[PDB]
Structure formats: C-alpha cells, structure tokens
Amino acid sequence: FQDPQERPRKLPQLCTELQTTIHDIILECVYCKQQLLRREVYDFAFRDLCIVYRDGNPYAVCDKCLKFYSKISEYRHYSYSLYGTTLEQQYNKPLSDLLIRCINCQKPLSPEEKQRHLDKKQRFHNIRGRWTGRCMSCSRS
Amino acid sequence: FQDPQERPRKLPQLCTELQTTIHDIILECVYCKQQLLRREVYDFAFRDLCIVYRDGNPYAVCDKCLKFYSKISEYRHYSYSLYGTTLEQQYNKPLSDLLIRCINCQKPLSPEEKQRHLDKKQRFHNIRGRWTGRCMSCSRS
Amino acid sequence: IDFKDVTYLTEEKVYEILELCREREDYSPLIRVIGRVFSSAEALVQSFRKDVSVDIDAIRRVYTRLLSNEKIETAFLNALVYLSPNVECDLTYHNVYSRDPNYLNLFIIVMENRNLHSPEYLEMALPLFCKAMSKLPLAAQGKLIRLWSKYNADQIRRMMETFQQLITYKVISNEFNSRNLVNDDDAIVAASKCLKMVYYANVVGGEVDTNHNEEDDEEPIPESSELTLQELLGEERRNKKGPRVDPLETELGVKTLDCRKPLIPFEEFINEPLNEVLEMDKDYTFFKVETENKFSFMTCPFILNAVTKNLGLYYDNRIRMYSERRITVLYSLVQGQQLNPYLRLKVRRDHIIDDALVRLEMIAMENPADLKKQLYVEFEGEQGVDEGGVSKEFFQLVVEEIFNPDIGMFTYDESTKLFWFNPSSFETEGQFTLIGIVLGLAIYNNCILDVHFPMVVYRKLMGKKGTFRDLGDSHPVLYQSLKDLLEYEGNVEDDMMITFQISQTDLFGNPMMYDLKENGDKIPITNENRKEFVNLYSDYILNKSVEKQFKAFRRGFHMVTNESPLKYLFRPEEIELLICGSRNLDFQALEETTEYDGGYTRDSVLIREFWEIVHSFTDEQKRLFLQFTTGTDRAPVGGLGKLKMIIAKNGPDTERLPTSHTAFNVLLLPEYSSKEKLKERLLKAITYA
Amino acid sequence: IDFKDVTYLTEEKVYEILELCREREDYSPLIRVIGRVFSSAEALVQSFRKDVSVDIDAIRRVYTRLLSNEKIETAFLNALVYLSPNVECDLTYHNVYSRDPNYLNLFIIVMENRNLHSPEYLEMALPLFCKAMSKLPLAAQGKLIRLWSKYNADQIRRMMETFQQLITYKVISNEFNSRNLVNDDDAIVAASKCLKMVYYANVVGGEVDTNHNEEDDEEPIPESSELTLQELLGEERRNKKGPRVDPLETELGVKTLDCRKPLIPFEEFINEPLNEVLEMDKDYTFFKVETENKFSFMTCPFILNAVTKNLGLYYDNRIRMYSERRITVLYSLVQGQQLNPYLRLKVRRDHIIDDALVRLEMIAMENPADLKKQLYVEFEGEQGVDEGGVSKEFFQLVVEEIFNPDIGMFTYDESTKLFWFNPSSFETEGQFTLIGIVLGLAIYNNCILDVHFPMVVYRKLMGKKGTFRDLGDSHPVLYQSLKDLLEYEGNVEDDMMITFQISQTDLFGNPMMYDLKENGDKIPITNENRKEFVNLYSDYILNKSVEKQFKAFRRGFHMVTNESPLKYLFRPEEIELLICGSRNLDFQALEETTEYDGGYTRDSVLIREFWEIVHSFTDEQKRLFLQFTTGTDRAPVGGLGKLKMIIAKNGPDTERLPTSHTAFNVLLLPEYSSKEKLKERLLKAITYA
Ligand SMILES: [Zn+2]
Ligand SMILES: [Zn+2]
Ligand SMILES: [Zn+2]
Ligand SMILES: [Zn+2]
C-alpha cells in the first residue's frame, strides 16, 4: 500500500484487494492494535469508515476505541450547535445531501434520522467543521 | 484526657486547661495529622467545632480536610431537603433555635443567614439528621 | 314556611320540614334551608348532633329519605361547591380545628352523601372537597381514619372508588406530559391525599398485629471518616431518627406491615391511569427536594403499581450510585488516589461462593460504602468490560450455588417448589450474609434473581416474625397437621399423646427432641393450651429454629438496602416481584418494544421470519431464548415489554450461530437465507449456551 | 382634490400637492395621500424615483419642506406603524427582495425621516421598523451599509443614536433579570441588529486598509488521536473553515481590523444600560447553542463594554477548562490513567524563565491540548495548593524576568514607558514563544499582566502589519524625524543627503547599515519616492526588523487563544485592557464590593478604621496594598469593584502583621487595638512583601 490513492479507503475494496470477504477478513484497531471482532468489522463497514494506513498497513477501529475518541473529540473540539433548518439555510442544501454522522458512533445519519432531528427540534453539532447528530441506536435511553 | 467528660470539648476550654491562649495553641488536624495554621485555629474556634481525642490526645481539623470530608458527607449521606418554613413546622421552633451549620464549612448559621434562606426560598438539607445550610462566605460566587 | 330562623338541622327536624313541604307541593324552602346550612361550615358543625358528636346512623337515614328525588340532589351538589372553598382556607389559615375538634363533623356529613360516587360531582364538587380534606391537620385525619376504620369492606370500597374515579377523571380530562406535570395538579394531588386516608382506614381497620416484630435491623456504622466528622460537630451521641416514614403512620400508630388482612385488597388502591402518565425521574426529585407546588406520589406509594415503584427505587439507587462516582473523583483529585467508581468483584467460576464471600466480607468491614458503588463483576482469566452482562451472569451463578442441595444452606420442598432456611446449617453465617448481600445487590443493581422463597421470608426481611398463618406457605404439610389439631372437637389430651416436646429430623436422619416450653415432656397438650402450643410451634420453626441463619441473612440484606426507600415503597408481597421477576413470558409485548440495528427494520424479511419462529416456540424454548439474549429466563417487573430488546444485523448469511450481547439485551442476528435455516441456527444457539 | 388616483409620489408632485393644499387651508388630502402611499411597501417602492433608484437629495428636500408642521408629522408616525408589519412578514415569508432589488427603497425613505430621532417613535413606530430591517437579506443589508457608508460623521451619529435610544428606552421601560431575559426581547434584538448595520457602515466608510495583513497565524495541529479519527471519517484532507465570523463581514468584504479610523469612535456604539442588565452566562449559551427565540449579544460585540466582553471570554475559557476536566476523568476511567486536570507547571524561583521554557515547549509538542487545562503553578521546595495565588505570583515574576534589560528580549523606551521587540535578539525564539504563551495563558486563566506594549504589538497580534501611523506610539522620536521629511516643502534630495540606506545602532554600539531597497546607497531620496521611503522605513522597523521575534511571539499567543472568540470579540485596542488592567485605583468602588468574614461587618469599629487608613493612603501605598492583597497592583477590567475583596478577622489583637490570601483576594486582619496600631502593622505588612 505504498501508493496513496491506489490503496483501498473502504472495507469492501480492501476485502476485494486482499481476495477475502468481510465475513473472514482480519483487522486490527488503529488505536489499541487489537484484532477486531467480527461484529466490529460489520459495524466498521456499516458505519462507512475509512481504512487507516500506518507504516504501510491497513487498520480499522474497534467499537470501544471509536466511541472513546469520538467522545474526546466531542468534548474538546465542539464548536457550536445549529438547528436543521439553519443548517439547510447555511448550505442551501437539504439535510439528505449533507454528510452528518452520529456524534457517538460516527454512523452516517440516515434521512429518517435527520428528519427526526428536524421534527423534534434537535440541534446538530459542529466538531472541527464536522456536522454530527444522534443516531437511533445512540438516541435510545 | 482519660476522663471522657472532664476533657474539654471546645477550643477555649482546651486553651484554658493547657494554660495557653488561642493565639499560641498548637493543634494538629485529626485527619492529616498536620499542624494547624493560626488562621485555621481561629476558624476552628469561630466555627464552633469540637475537640476530637484520639489515643488520649486533643485534635482539631484543618480547613482543607474539614471541607473535603464535609463534601463527602454531603455527597454520600444526603437525605432530603426542606424549606425553612417546613422546618419550623416540623420542629415547632424558630430557625434561630435550630442548630443549622453550613453544608460546606460547618459554620453554625447565624440568624441573618437563616433569614436569607427563608427570604430567597433556599432549601435546608439533611445529612444523617444534621440540618445544613449555606453560609455567606460559601454563598458568594 | 321558609324556616328562615333555623341554622342547625336535626334528624327529626328535617323530617318535619320534609313532611310539611311534601303535601304543599313546594320543596323550594327545603332547597333553600339545605343550601344555607350545608354551605356554611359553622352551620354543619351544629347540624345532626347527638369520638364524634354527629350521630352516624341519623344522617344516613336523612340522606336516604331525602335524596330520592331530582331537585334537592342538585342543592347538595351546589352546596358542596360553595362550602368547600370556605372550609379549605379556613383550615389552612384560621387553624380552626385546634380551637375545637367538633369541626371534623362537616366532613363526616359530606362524605355520607351517596351521590359523591356519582359522576356529576367529579367536575366541580368533589375536587373542591378533596382540596379541603387534604388541609385537615394530622390529628384531625387520625380521628377520621379511626372513624372510617369501623366500616365494612363494601363501605370502604365506596370510599376508595370515590377518590379513584376523581383521579381517573382528572387524568383523562387533562393532558399530562413532561411539560405539564401531574405533580402540580392540585385536584389529583388532593384526591391522592384523600385516598391515603381511606388507605390507612383500610389498614388499621383490618387484621392488625403490631406485636410480632423482629429485632431492629443492625444499622451499619458509617465510614470512619464520617464518624470523625460527627465528633467534630458534636453529634456523635445523637443519632439519625431513621428512614422516611409517613406522618399518618406515627399518628395512627399502625403500619401497613402490621396489617395482615386488610378489608380491601391493597392492589385495589392502585390508580392505573395515573401510573401510565407519571414521570418518576421528576417524581423522585420532589420526593427528596421539597418544592412549593410540586407533590411527590412516592409519598403515597400505595397508588403506584409495581412498575412505577420499581422505577422510583431505580432512580434512588442510580442517584446513590452517581454520588459514589463523584466521591471517587474527588478522592483521586484531592487525595491523589486511584479512580474506582465500581464495586469491583473478582471471582472464579469454579469458586464463585468462596471468592465472593471473602471479597464481600472484607468490603463490609473496611469500606462498607463500597457496596453503594455500581457492581462490577469480572471472572478470573476472562478479561472484558462489565457493562451488566457479567453481573447478570454472576447473579445467576451464585443463586444456583447458594441454593444447591449439597451446600446445606436451604432445604428444597418439592410440593411448594420453594426453598426454606435449613436449621441444620452450622458455621455458615458468612454465607448467609453473602446471599443477603447478593439479594440486596441485585436490587441495587437492577438484576432479577431466580429465587424461590416463601412469603414469610420476605415478611421477616422487613421485620415481622413468622406466625401460624405463614406456616401454610412454608410447610403446608405440617400446617395441615397443626390446624387439624386446632379444630379437633374431641379431647386432644386423650386422642393424641402429643406434648410440648417436638421431634426434628436432621439432614443425616438422626432425630433430636426440642422442647417448646421449659419441660414440654412433662406438660401434655390439653384443649386449654392447645392454641398456645401451635403458637409456640409456629414461632419456633419460622423464627427461633433459624434465628442465627436469618439474622446474618437479614444483616447482609440491610447493609445494601438500608438507605433506599425500599422499606417505605414496598410491602413484603411486592418484594418478591421486585427481587425476582414475572414468570409470564408475553412475547407479544416483547415484539412491540423490540428495536433494530445494523440495517434491520420491523419490515425486514428475516425479522418477520424471526418473529414467526419465536412465537411458535414452546415455553421451554422461550425460556432458553430469554436467558440466551437477556441473561435471565424471567421477565422483568411488568413484562417482556420492559425488556427493550434489540435485534442487530450481524453480517451476511453463514453457518455461524446468532450471538447476543446480554448486557444490553442485544441479539446479534446474521442475515440467514431462509426461515428454516434461521430456526436451525437460532435453536442451536440458545440450546447450547 | 383628494388625489385618490395616485400611488407613487415625486419630488415635485408632493410640491404641487402641498402648494394647492396650502392656501385652501385643508391639509387633510395630503395627510390621506401620505398615509396611503407610505403605509404601502409597493407604493413606496415606486415613490421618489430617479446603486439605488431613489434620489437621495430629493427626499431630504421633501421631508424638510413638509415636516415643519404638527399635523402631518403624526401621519408619518402612524404610516410607519402600519407599513412595518406588512413589510416584515413580506421579507420573512414572501422573499420579496430576491424578486427585485428595488424593494430596498422604502428603507431609505423611512430612514430619511428626521423625526425617527424624536422620542415619539420609540413606543410603537421605531421598534416595528427595526423588526422589519432585521429581516432584510444579507445582500440587501450589504447595499444599505454601502449606501450608508458615504454619509458624514454627523449623519452616522444620528443613525447610531436612533437605535441607541430605542435600546435604552426598551431597557428602561421593561424589567429584565434572570427570569425575563433581554435575549428574548425582539424589539431590543431588532434594534441591536439594526445598530450593526450602522456599525459596519461606520467601519467600511472610514479609513480602511485591507492589504497590510500579516501572515496567517500557524494553526496548531490537533492531537494525534484526533488526527487518527479524522482519517477514519475520511475528513483528513478537508479542514475546518476557521473561527466564527459575522456574515456581514464576508458580504461587505471589510473587517473592523481593516478599519483604522472610523467616522465615529467605536466606543460610542456601546449601549451602557444594556450591559448592566445582560447575563453573560446565558448569553454565551445562545452564542454556542442556537435557540429558537433567544439572541446572543456576543454576535454583536460592538455593543458590549470591556467588562461584558471580558465575562463572555471568561465563560468560553471556563467551559473549555471544564471540557478538559471531563476528558481527564474519562482517560482515568477508560484508559486507567492518572487524573491530571491541570496544566501543571513546576518551576524554580531563581530559574523561572528556563523552567517554564522547557516545560511549556515540551507540552506544545507532545500534548498541545494541555495548554487548555487550568493552569497550576507550583514552585520547587514550597509545597501547597495552587488556587490561583501561585499562578498570579508566577505571572508577575515572568513578566519582570522577560522584560528585564539584561535578557535582551525587549528594549525599554524611557519617554513612552513602553517595551519594544529588540531586533538585536538572536537565538531567543523559544523565549519569545514563551512570553506569547504566557500572555495567552494569562488571558486563558483570567490574570492581568504588568505589560507595557505599543498598540502596534496588539495590532500585529491580530494580523495587521504595523504602518507609518503606528510608528508614533512605538518610536515617536523617529516618527517625528520621518513626518518632518514628509511635509518638507524644499527639495529633499538637496537639503538632506539621506538615501534608501539606513543605519541601525546595535546594543553593543556598533552600527550596521541596512538597505531598504536592493541598492539604497545608489538611489537617493527625492520628492517622487519620498513617500515610498517612509513606507519602506516604517515597514522595516515595525514588521521586517523583528519578523522572527514576532513570529514566535505570535505563534505562542495563538496556540492558547486560537479557539477562543478573542479575535471575534475584541479589537486590538481592547486587547491591552484585557491582557493588562486599569491603572486607575478607585478605592471607593473597592469599599462597596468588599465582603467580611470571621465576625467582621461593614459596621465593625476596626473596619471603619481600616477604610479611613486606606483612603488616606498615597498612590504608592495603594499599589502596595493591592499587590499584597490581590497579587497585582493593577485593577481588573472595569475597576476595583470587580476585585471582590474579603476582609476576614484573624484572631485577637497582636503584633502579628495582617496576612492575605492572594488567590481569593482575602485580607486576614487581626482585631488590632487602635487605628494607629492598625496602620503601623498594615504599612509594615504591605511594604515588606
Ligand atoms: Zn481499539
Ligand atoms: Zn450512534
Ligand atoms: Zn487535615
Ligand atoms: Zn460556609
């Protein structure tokens, strides 16, 4: 993976490049260097995360490290909060065309989740220019 | 100080018993075993605290240990809060006849402080049957 | 005649007014006099005179003689609307009950009105009256309750339904949510305060036994640092009065614990529509922190159901758990200690009893406040975060090892399917404290246990010694052989040579004779002392035969639950459903509250195939599925709807069995090809673990 | 004639209507036509036609010709009351400005009314108009501001006072507190939004120089963990747009930094009555968290005074400090690390510069986020808790060692009493980053510094290169010798042989010649390039002679204050009062806000004797008392009233000097016998430390 653009940036392309499937691929967390559980690999692909290359090696993130560092980023790098309507006015774009991730798990918000944000007047948060929301899994009490 | 009742329970009586004054008496904190500062001795007498005897030796409390353990007692042993009016109904007594200490520094509340509690509708707190309030020094922002 | 110069009425004076106003075909003077005297508190004080000055039977005859029509019944409706506001502020400000206790009369007169039950009073009349009654002083309420305690069950039922439908109507009429609370609704609050008077009339009017009280539970001493602080404040001698109690409990002198058989079942006082709308997070706040116009319904726990009471206890333990989080942070900040916000419990799977015994015993001495921390269980070797799944696993494991026959702690009864304390268990007081702690820890940490106890155990936990009535659930066979003696018409001395000496069979098989009296062999059983022998016989087995085993068990349960409102909120019959769960597996309620993740939805093809499989499951396979996914085979308080299960997608179709995250009731379901494959893998998954 | 078939008015048509309605002694048709066309937005669009379609001078003549009386002036009052609600919702919903830009006309017509300044519009007319203007789109506001920027200072003054007294009136008229806020008052909010348009018209209409901008401040890279997270999200390439900026700043393209000399002094836009009633704890909340009907006044910082702006910055830093507390707790919880919620700074008193240099440099590499923690300073040997007193002591000490002559960092000017960056300072970039960090740390930790800098330093900190105008404050003597050249009527080439080569004196004394151009010795100074030489001369000393020293200084200041709204809230002239304090010692304001402890009261005999002594203190002894009690001899922003001093009783009469707890501005005062004894001990206490 010496070539920067050639190396896969997503889990399906990485699996195809290594001639393996997401059902059997073996990955390590970029933070804790520990092998990812199978459900963690499935979450990684479901959360549309990017493969991280350290010293020419493909890495992923485990669930606990992802949530920990997302919490740290929310705590230390929070900028401001906006209403979904104000977000659309600022970008002149529908929320469905904006990449908004869950503040906790970094899962890209579905259009239904953004609609719920609009309906309940829940605010979207900005963390170093990244717009974050709350997903259903992390919204439940 | 073998005799339980004979040994002084207050700073002035302890000073008189040792033939010293509060201006020169040397005392140690019961918790940290460290010598009390002069202003700490004056606070101890001003806060109407009781001399504690460990292994037949008179002890006092320093300011930081007193505040720390008062905070711990407030956190772990808090029972419930009442309005001053409800307190008077419960005891059929004026607040001036009730020994209410500051929740932070354990200074007995003055009648003016209890009057302020009544006026601003500030609640008195119960911590293992001890009724606590907020003194002026600890009420300031 | 208008009768314009009469202020007090009489049992026979209303009769003469009615008879002279009957044939003249003009009741209007009667309407006027009733609306005049009933709307005035002072007039009602002197009306229908003779621990009360009003003749009880007189007014009942007057009401039934006079309410048969349709005109005057409206006058009583409107008279109550005027009298109540003038009698509420009169009690609140003037303090008129202290001047003379005869002022309570008007409340008996009003509550004797049969039409209060009717639905024409719920709009304006009854809500206003309940506001006035809730302002009665404690002494005044004591006499009203004692007067009401003499009524029959049917009379008490009418009184209870009167305030129940007022609560039901106001909940239906108004819209209550997190914005507009029920706590600030004075009409519902007053009707709840009035229902409490009927509730205690139910208690003190039934079968009350205030004497057979167990020894006061040993109060755990506070931490050494707290003891030092009380010395500095000069409060080490005086001690805290104890847990919160209802003031009406003290005034009447009778507790719901003392009530064995109330006239009305306690479960009838639960207003269900109120419970579905109550918010216990803020109800608990008004319970601990007094607010000017907010009323806590936890102060009247008889009206809450098991689910609502469970929530209020959960918030109390949760709040206490958080206070331990803040204390450890301050200890790490100020004293530079290690962050330990957990009741860390390292145990071995093969030695779970011994490892938990030494760990929990050591805590109960050094830092007894650590029991108030969130429980963290970790097994040796297997390393992982305990989010609740390990604690649920630990709680299940200890119950089996505690109640296993070989340990000798408890004797299992096949007929009742219940465990009883084994009297032949010696040198095991540490283990009995352990199972008491575990039960308290399970309550504290919101984990249900697979524990089968007779109701007498839960009665003794709250401090009531078992009686002969409790022997039926514990030992039905011996209970039957003892009541048969009770109703023996013949001479018991002649027919059966039983005496005050009893024979107990040990676990080994060797019987040793126990003497209930000083010399029970000498004294035989006669008809005169036949009642006493049964009382001493029942007192021995339930209380004195297991006194040391239960003392440790009760002590361990107390050191965890002493600061909780558990004793305040729950009756002993409600403790079993709190510690354990429902045995009912309503998988329909499980379906409604189930959530989905990983791309699954309620309309996913595999999801519908999944629910079709599990609804066709047998009872045994339903229990296996519950234990596999949630860690316990029992439903929580309420039902499986409270078990907010999550079915999350786990990769593509495969031969891998479905997995479960027991901590969060999450089922990890691969997207299998067909329904037959899904069942085979799901059955293989739950029948293996 | 009523003129009932005319909708648009004209500069001469109103003249003919007025002249025909004058001698007839019935102005009523004129009232009717004015109330018809002015109350209609579409009518006003076509009225008084010709980057605007309305003749500016035409309407001014019409207003002055027609407002001289007392009847029609009421019609304009009432026409504004009707037009505004129909023009606010028209902008808010219909989006009428996008369809045609001629809709902005009616706002010029209304704002040309002289009577808007009068106090008969503050009740109903002006508040409604301001609501409509605040709903103008950003593009519409851009043209209004550019049109308003061409006015003279007196015209801008009238515009500013118009919205100022509306804000003042509504603050006086209404009662604002923590219950009823000012943020939800739409009339004040709209008038503040309208005042912003005048504020930017003031900025873009004055002396604006947008070219002499310093290099973009080096943005500190986030922590390595944050960089890893952005890679996982696929956002490592794209970067954050930057700090919050006003949208009007982008549309106009001119910033308040670019404005050197506004037409009106910026300090005139501060509405004092609004500042005394604003609650910055919740104002900051609405600044960060958008709320439906709450408006942050930090979005319009020109209206806040230094005290209010200081509070808003304090809350931002405080909030960021707390976020670092929560992160360390999570690090100790999850990662099992040590609790370090502090920017720990162990230094030696004799080597404070070197110890802080190595400690702060090491932090800026490994964990640059540690600079956002609350500063904890501890000196070697002396062990104690740093509640702020040690940090205040450290900040005072470093400034003396940094600005000491021997270190060679700064050259002191006796005449100006200011320090300037020493160009002869080499191999000291680490120390210049240190003093930049210290200045940022003092702001972050709310500590004022005894720093004397020319205003050009604070201008360069925000990214504006020093110009010839800034040379007066820095080097007045050389500034005088350079403007004297500027206005030299004679031939500069003949009289003075100065060229584009300059001579700079080193600290040693050896002069080295510097060339402003490529060959400045060859090229002489003529009248044609006389202006350019001064520009290059000023650009060298202020910007290019100290570029490396200031680059490190600016870098260190940026790594602490980059995330703060400091650049947003404060102009460079307001930075000096923020970093430093007031030099004014108003000991009367100190008396009013002083609190008492240990038994002291405002009426205590020694307390009155104490205030009598300190009010008779000289300026030197007042500074000694301030430094001894509060740790600094300078007053905070505002005055000594903000220094909430506490005088606490310390035992009985003695020979012991009064002590002070500098962290909390607490003076520990023994109860001395007399006033003479109190002065002797107090003077002995403050003249020793
Ligand atoms: Zn990891
Ligand atoms: Zn999420
Ligand atoms: Zn201490
Ligand atoms: Zn205090």
Side-chain angles (χ1 to χ4, degrees), chain C residues 377-392:
Chain C
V377 189
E378 53 187 338
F379 296 107
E380 275 211 339
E382 37 263 35
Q383 295 175 334
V385 202
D386 181 18
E387 314 99 329
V390 200
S391 295
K392 284 203 264 198

Side-chain angles (χ1 to χ4, degrees), chain A residues 29 32 62 65:
Chain A
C29 181
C32 60
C62 76
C65 275

Side-chain angles (χ1 to χ4, degrees), chain D residues 340-374:
Chain D
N340 190 202
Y342 288 130
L343 181 60
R344 201 66 75 114
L345 200 58
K346 188 91 77 42
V347 291
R348 285 164 307 174
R349 279 203 191 255
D350 325 300
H351 321 254
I352 189 151
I353 290 300
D354 323 308
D355 282 356
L357 177 63
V358 175
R359 179 60 178 163
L360 286 179
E361 203 96 17
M362 150 69 42
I363 294 161
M365 308 333 135
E366 286 201 302
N367 34 21
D370 282 19
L371 290 172
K372 300 302 170 320
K373 302 187 178 158
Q374 171 156 59

Side-chain angles (χ1 to χ4, degrees), chain C residues 406-604:
Chain C
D406 319 318
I407 201 184
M409 281 183 107
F410 302 95
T411 60
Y412 187 51
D413 194 309
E414 293 298 353
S415 70
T416 52
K417 327 215 202 322
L418 301 171
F419 294 92
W420 175 243
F421 282 73
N422 178 42
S424 293
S425 202
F426 295 97
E427 293 177 350
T428 48
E429 293 177 350
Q431 275 114 309
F432 281 108
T433 318
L434 165 73
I435 187 51
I437 287 163
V438 157
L439 253 74
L441 281 189
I443 299 169
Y444 192 69
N445 292 280
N446 203 46
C447 290
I448 52 176
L449 300 176
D450 210 332
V451 166
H452 313 331
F453 272 152
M455 185 69 41
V456 57
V457 174
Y458 302 104
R459 296 211 81 247
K460 290 169 61 71
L461 265 183
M462 326 287 259
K464 298 301 288 188
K465 262 178 222 171
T467 58
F468 175 63
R469 324 189 267 281
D470 303 295
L471 212 81
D473 289 345
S474 177
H475 324 119
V477 152
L478 183 94
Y479 172 76
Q480 198 57 276
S481 88
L482 269 175
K483 50 178 306 284
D484 284 9
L485 186 103
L486 272 197
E487 41 247 41
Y488 195 81
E489 307 284 357
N491 292 337
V492 300
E493 185 177 4
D494 295 345
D495 188 32
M496 292 177 72
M497 297 65 177
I498 310 299
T499 60
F500 268 80
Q501 64 180 20
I502 36 173
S503 287
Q504 195 59 57
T505 306
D506 195 270
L507 299 179
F508 287 134
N510 50 315
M512 294 300 293
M513 293 177 182
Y514 178 85
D515 289 345
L516 299 147
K517 278 203 153 186
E518 312 95 357
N519 46 2
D521 52 301
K522 174 67 64 60
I523 273 64
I525 280 169
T526 88
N527 275 51
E528 283 317 78
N529 55 351
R530 165 176 74 179
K531 179 62 173 171
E532 164 158 359
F533 159 80
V534 181
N535 289 337
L536 253 62
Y537 203 0
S538 294
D539 193 285
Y540 162 70
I541 328 169
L542 292 184
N543 310 302
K544 271 185 228 220
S545 155
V546 286
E547 75 278 68
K548 270 199 257 313
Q549 292 87 357
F550 213 95
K551 197 174 99 64
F553 175 79
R554 193 155 125 78
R555 188 177 79 80
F557 183 76
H558 196 56
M559 51 194 49
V560 184
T561 76
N562 53 315
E563 320 286 355
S564 50
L566 164 73
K567 230 146 198 284
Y568 182 72
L569 289 190
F570 294 91
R571 305 184 332 267
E573 291 83 357
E574 320 172 294
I575 301 281
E576 180 193 10
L577 179 68
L578 166 66
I579 293 175
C580 295
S582 304
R583 291 177 64 84
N584 64 45
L585 295 174
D586 184 29
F587 265 58
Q588 302 292 350
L590 184 64
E591 162 131 11
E592 328 283 300
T593 41
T594 300
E595 302 275 42
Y596 308 90
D597 256 317
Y600 277 157
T601 311
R602 213 150 297 234
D603 306 309
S604 294

Side-chain angles (χ1 to χ4, degrees), chain C residues 166-329:
Chain C
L166 181 57
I167 296 159
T168 303
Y169 171 85
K170 292 264 169 329
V171 165
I172 269 57
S173 305
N174 205 341
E175 214 254 331
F176 297 113
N177 44 68
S178 75
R179 185 176 179 83
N180 165 239
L181 303 185
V182 197
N183 318 99
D184 57 356
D185 188 296
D186 36 8
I188 298 177
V189 165
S192 295
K193 293 205 230 243
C194 291
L195 195 64
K196 159 185 294 156
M197 269 171 264
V198 185
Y199 174 74
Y200 282 111
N202 192 31
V203 164
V204 314
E207 172 155 316
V208 190
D209 198 348
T210 80
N211 282 336
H212 296 189
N213 278 28
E214 298 238 353
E215 265 98 320
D216 296 329
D217 216 323
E218 279 75 54
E219 164 63 37
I221 50 196
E223 62 271 9
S224 72
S225 96
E226 179 70 28
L227 283 183
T228 318
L229 179 58
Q230 309 189 160
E231 301 190 64
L232 294 153
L233 311 178
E235 310 303 316
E236 188 88 324
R237 261 78 78 195
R238 290 178 182 170
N239 315 101
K240 182 181 183 62
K241 295 178 179 178
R244 306 293 299 285
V245 85
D246 215 23
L248 262 182
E249 296 248 44
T250 325
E251 154 97 25
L252 290 165
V254 154
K255 329 140 92 172
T256 317
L257 254 181
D258 311 325
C259 181
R260 302 282 330 233
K261 184 54 163 213
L263 322 157
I264 312 303
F266 287 127
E267 298 73 23
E268 276 197 79
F269 282 87
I270 302 161
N271 190 267
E272 285 294 332
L274 178 61
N275 279 287
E276 329 165 330
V277 86
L278 217 34
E279 228 43 55
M280 290 306 255
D281 48 356
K282 30 197 64 150
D283 217 298
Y284 177 75
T285 297
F286 312 140
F287 183 59
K288 299 300 237 202
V289 165
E290 188 190 16
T291 318
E292 189 51 280
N293 289 76
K294 309 278 199 293
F295 169 84
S296 202
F297 285 95
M298 302 177 77
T299 58
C300 295
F302 61 87
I303 210 174
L304 318 159
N305 52 30
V307 154
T308 320
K309 291 212 284 295
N310 194 32
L311 242 200
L313 175 72
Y314 168 86
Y315 286 131
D316 182 89
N317 301 310
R318 188 52 52 177
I319 286 302
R320 185 162 286 104
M321 254 153 194
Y322 298 148
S323 311
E324 296 308 306
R325 310 254 178 79
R326 298 180 186 89
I327 287 162
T328 57
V329 173

